[PDB]
Design a binder for this molecule. Structure first.
Ligand SMILES: CN1Cc2cc(S(=O)(=O)N3CCOCC3)ccc2N(C)C1=O
Length: 126
């Protein structure tokens, strides 16, 4: 079995910015979600080999996780907050698509998403 390469976290041709919203996404949103009790399954790319989920990357073609998001924020990969917010939403949606409703992992993602949305409705301006 084989995992795909992780999503891109470095690209010298991609334009970058450090905005107040992106700083907030790292300092408040990511920081808070990362230390949540249910963060651990989302702190790295889904390891389909280790978890014995050989169909995962057949079903999920746009993988995302908070480890990748953390790298993107810390290494100034983004041009804007929308890109980052989309990464969070992709992470949640992938989880809901792949896993059965009411699976533990889904309940965990839902708890993180609830927190995420509370933090996001208080972003600074752009
Ligand atoms: C986000 N994850 C990570 C993951 C983790 C695991 S897990 O680590 O076995 N696990 C199951 C119970 O909930 C806690 C996490 C199983 C499947 C996945 N897949 C399919 C994902 O969607």
């Amino acid at each position: 079995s084989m995992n795909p390469p992780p999503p891109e976290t470095s690209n010298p041709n991609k334009p970058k910015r450090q905005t107040n919203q992106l700083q907030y996404l790292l300092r408040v949103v990511l920081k808070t979600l990362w230390k949540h009790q249910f963060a651990w399954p989302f702190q790295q790319p889904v390891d389909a080999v280790k978890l014995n989920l050989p169909d995962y990357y057949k079903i999920i073609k746009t993988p995302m996780d908070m480890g990748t998001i953390k790298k993107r924020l810390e290494n100034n990969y983004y041009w804007n907050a929308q890109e980052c917010i989309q990464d969070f939403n992709t992470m949640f949606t992938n989880c809901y698509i792949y896993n059965k409703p009411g699976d533990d992992i889904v309940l965990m993602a839902e708890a993180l998403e609830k927190l995420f949305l509370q933090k996001i409705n208080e972003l600074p301006t752009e």
